[PDB]
C-alpha cells in the first residue's frame, strides 16, 4: 500500500505539476499575443 | 482624449486607471481596488504575472467603443491625459517630476486619435522622467520597457 | 412626453422598458435584466406568463405618479415614443420595419396623455408592421394581443 | 457652506445627513441608511447610544474638507440648511412646521464657517418648535439637548 500510494503521489505530481508548469509557459507565452488584437502569432 | 478611459477606485478615491483597447480592458495588476463601471467589473480578469497587468474581454456592448491600436511609434511627441509625452530611442519621456502615484493605467495616444502605450509608473533620468510603460512591438508583441528604478505609480 | 416610464438595464443595454400603470409597475417578462430605478427594483414583481408580463405594486412613494390606463380605444392614431402609431381593425399598426428589439415595454399613449397599451413586439405581412400588445376590453378586462407570427422584441 | 455636507442614502432617498468635524464623521445612530460618500461609507462607525451618534476618523486625503467646530455660541442668527435658525435661551428655534423628518444630522453653522450643533429632530408641544441637538460645552465636552417631546427627524 505504501508503494502504491507512492506511485499515486508521484503520478499526481507528474500530472498536476507538469501541467502547472506547461500552463504557466503557455499562459505567459500567449498573453504577449492575446493582449495584442492585431499580432500575427 | 480621455473620453473612453475609465477610472479605478480604491475605497472611494482614484488610485489608477483602466482602459479598453481591442475590445478588452487592461488595468495594472498592482492597482488594488474595483473598476467603477459595473459592466467592466463583471469581467473575469486574466493575470499576466510578469506584465503587472490583468485583462479581460469587455462585454459585447461597448465592442464598438474600444480604443484602436497602432504599432506606429515614430520618435516625437505623443498626447497624454496629463500632457504631451516625448518618445525617443526606446524611452518615453515626461517633463521631470510631473505626474506621479495613482496615475498608473493612463493611456498614451497617437495624434491619429489612437493609443500607443499605457503607463505603469516611471522615474526621472535627470533630464526627463522616464515612464515604465507597455508598448507593443512592430510585430504587435506587447513589449514592456521600464528603465531601472522606475517606481510604480 | 413620457418621462414617467423606465427602461430595464441589462448589461447596460435597454433591452426593454417598463411603465407604472395604476400604481403597479409592469415590464415584459421576456425582457431580462434589472430595471433602471433602484426603488422600483425593490418591488418583487408577480408574473403572468400568459401575458408575458409581470406586475407588482410600486412602493408608496410614487404610486401617485402612475400613468392612467385607458379603456377606450377608438380607431385612430395613438402616441408612442417613436412618434405615433395607427390603430386599425383592433390592432396597432406601424410603418414597415420601424421599431424593433428592445422596444418591448414601451407604452402607447392616448392623445389625452394616458396609456392605452404596452407593446410586446410586432410582425410584418409585407405591407405593414402589426404590433403585439397588451390591451383592455371595453369592460376593462386586460388582454394580450399577438398578430399571426408575432415576434417579441 | 453646505458643500462639505453629505446625504444618507436609505432606500435611495435622503433620509438623513452626515457631517465630518475635525476629521471625524458623525451622523445620528437612530437614522438608518447608507452614507452617500464612498470614503465616508468606509469609515468604521463607533457607537455612542446615549448621544444617539456613531463616528469614526476619515482619511488624510479628505482632511481639509472636515468641518471646523467651536463652542462659542452667543444668541442670535445662525445659518442653517433651511436658511437660518434662532439660537436663544440655550436652544435653536425655527418657524413651527419647517424642517421636519429627513433633516436629522444637518449641521448648524457660525458665519465663520464653524459648526455649532447637529440637529437630531424636532420638539413642538406647548409654545413653539425647539430643535433637539448635540452641542459643545465651553470645556469642549459634548452635550445632547432634547426638550421634552423631542422626536427624531
UniProtKB/Swiss-Prot annotation, chains B, C, D:
Top-rank taxon, per record: Viruses
Protein location: Virion; Host cytoplasm; Host cell membrane; Host nucleus
Site entry: Involved in dimerization of the capsid protein: 78, 111
Modified residues (Phosphothreonine): 5
Modifications made to the protein after synthesis: Phosphorylated on serine and threonine residues.
UniProt-annotated catalytic positions: 30 (charge relay system), 52 (charge relay system), 104 (charge relay system)
Residues covered by the Peptidase S3 domain: 4-153
Chain positions with Phosphoserine modification: 2
Region ranges (Interaction with spike glycoprotein E2): 46-51, 138-142
Assembly: Homodimer. Homomultimer. Interacts with host karyopherin KPNA4; this interaction allows the nuclear import of the viral capsid protein. Interacts with spike glycoprotein E2. Interacts with host IRAK1; the interaction leads to inhibition of IRAK1-dependent signaling. Part of a tetrameric complex composed of host CRM1, host importin alpha/beta dimer and the viral capsid; this complex blocks the receptor-mediated transport through the nuclear pore. Interacts with host phosphatase PPP1CA; this interaction dephosphorylates the capsid protein, which increases its ability to bind to the viral genome.
Record's comment describing the protein's domains: The very N-terminus plays a role in the particle assembly process. The N-terminus also contains a nuclear localization signal and a supraphysiological nuclear export signal (supraNES), which is an unusually strong NES that mediates host CRM1 binding in the absence of RanGTP and thus can bind CRM1, not only in the nucleus, but also in the cytoplasm. The C-terminus functions as a protease during translation to cleave itself from the translating structural polyprotein.
Protein function: Forms an icosahedral capsid with a T=4 symmetry composed of 240 copies of the capsid protein surrounded by a lipid membrane through which penetrate 80 spikes composed of trimers of E1-E2 heterodimers. The capsid protein binds to the viral RNA genome at a site adjacent to a ribosome binding site for viral genome translation following genome release. Possesses a protease activity that results in its autocatalytic cleavage from the nascent structural protein.
UniProt-recorded name of the protein: Capsid protein
Originating organism: Western equine encephalitis virus (WEEV)
Full-protein residues shown: 107 to 259 of 1236
